[PDB]
């Protein structure tokens, strides 16, 4: 039971600084180098740097030099890595581990990450869309249908339909993000074509950032 | 900084297999490798380090191997916990660097999309903006090209798609792609359609609506 516990989720406005902890337990702290690790969307994982509780000795890649600063609480028993400059190119889940202490090293203690986003967006709920059966069509026999979830911030937002009923065939798709820097998301259910008059089909959209929830019918036409 | 070339960047594969992950330095690195597994949404977790030592707890059918700059994680017979994306990292000269990841999925039959258009709603036609969405559902493999066209001229930059992972029942995929128009350019033209081109398709199939 040797334990990594990182920062809770955190939103920051670009140009803005922002200091994320990781609290080290089970094991003498001092001896063990912290190691930082970066993870955002589409670029794998990439190697912040690393510092030792109680000398305090420190190591920067030099991509992350000017951007990211190391400090190790050892009373606490806490470690941090202040973030500065923040751009949406910083927008990632960063972790903090345990690696090596003088000569030795069995393997890592990842903590569980810490979620970090940087815009300049305020929080708004959505607008639902139906995404209607059949362009020209009704007999065709198997049918979709859905509802297109539109310009929302910030993350996440949640989707049922049927309220939980109705699982089968659902699709719902990652969130996107849209130029106005607002999200966009789909849940698509394809059904029977012949349940299209003898059926309901509304989806359930929530957003609790904005206190948001709206139950949507779709249908032909 | 010591390059790391891992290879394949994914690979599909069957329960049973013996599936093998490169990664190349290029530099002599001594050694000096770990390697990772993720999966999605959770944190990595190291599996060998030193290039060929297990991690105290992790299944015997993980071995890594090599020396000098040519490594190698080998999963002797996969299971499907396996799946996910795996790194190796070299930690042999600062700045320590990760080769850019290997994505393990599912292989299965070739399976055609069914695709679907779907018109802007006139509840937001309203607002002033048009979205105009084409489904392919259930396909794989992953690869796959939708392309727009309106009255025949060809939509680019104006559009955004996102996947759904393997499901967990028949491993197929799920895509969306929304075309996003001014009302105003939307009332401009007169044939919307959705061409899209995947394996499964012995030729190009096209779906689309007029107004």
């Known amino acids: 039971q040797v334990q990594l516990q990182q920062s809770g989720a955190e939103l920051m406005k670009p140009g803005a600084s922002v200091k994320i902890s990781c609290k080290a337990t089970?094991?003498?702290?001092?001896?063990?180098?912290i190691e930082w690790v970066k993870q955002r969307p589409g670029h794998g994982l990439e190697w912040i740097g690393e510092?030792?509780?109680?000398?305090?000795?420190?190591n920067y890649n030099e991509k992350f030099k000017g951007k990211a600063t190391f400090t190790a609480d050892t009373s606490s028993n806490t470690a941090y890595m202040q973030l500065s400059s923040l751009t949406s190119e910083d927008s990632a889940v960063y972790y903090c581990?345990?690696?090596?202490?003088?000569?030795?090293?069995?393997?890592?203690?990842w903590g569980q990450g810490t979620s970090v986003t940087v815009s300049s967006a305020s929080t708004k709920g959505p607008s639902v869309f139906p995404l209607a059966p059949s362009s020209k069509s009704t007999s065709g026999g198997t049918a979709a249908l859905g509802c297109l979830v539109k310009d929302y911030f910030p993350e996440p937002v949640t989707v049922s339909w049927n309220s939980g009923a109705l699982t089968s065939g659902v699709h719902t798709f990652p969130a996107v993000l849209q130029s106005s820097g607002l999200y966009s998301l789909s849940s698509v259910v394809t059904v029977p074509s012949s349940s299209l008059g003898t059926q309901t089909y509304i989806c359930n959209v929530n957003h609790k950032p904005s206190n948001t929830k709206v139950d949507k019918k779709v249908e032909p036409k | 900084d010591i390059k790391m070339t891992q290879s394949p960047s994914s690979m599909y594969a069957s329960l049973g297999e013996r599936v093998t992950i490169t990664c190349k330095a290029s530099?002599?690195?001594?050694?000096?490798l770990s390697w990772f597994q993720q999966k999605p949404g959770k944190s990595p977790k190291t599996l060998i380090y030193?290039?060929?030592r297990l991690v105290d707890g992790v299944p015997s059918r993980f071995s890594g191997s090599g020396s000098g700059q040519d490594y190698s994680l080998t999963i002797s017979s996969l299971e499907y916990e396996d799946m996910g994306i795996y790194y190796c990292?070299?930690?042999?000269?600062?700045?320590?660097?990760f080769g850019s990841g290997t994505k393990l999925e599912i292989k299965r039959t070739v399976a055609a999309p069914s695709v679907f258009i779907f018109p802007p709603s006139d509840e937001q036609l309203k607002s002033g903006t048009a979205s105009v969405v084409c489904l392919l559902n259930n396909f794989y493999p992953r690869e796959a090209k939708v392309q727009w066209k309106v009255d025949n001229a060809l939509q680019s930059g104006n559009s955004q798609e996102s996947v759904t992972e393997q499901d967990s029942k028949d491993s197929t995929y799920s895509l969306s792609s929304t075309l996003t128009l001014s009302k105003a350019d939307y009332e401009k033209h007169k044939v919307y359609a959705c061409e899209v081109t995947h394996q499964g398709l012995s030729s190009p199939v096209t779906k689309s609506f007029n107004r």
């Open positions: 089970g094991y003498t702290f001092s001896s063990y180098w």
């Open positions: 990292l070299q930690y042999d000269e600062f700045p320590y660097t």
């Open positions: 030193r290039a060929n």
């Open positions: 530099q002599d690195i001594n050694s000096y």
């Open positions: 510092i030792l509780p109680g000398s305090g000795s420190t």
């Open positions: 581990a345990r690696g090596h202490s003088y000569y030795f090293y069995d393997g890592d203690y």
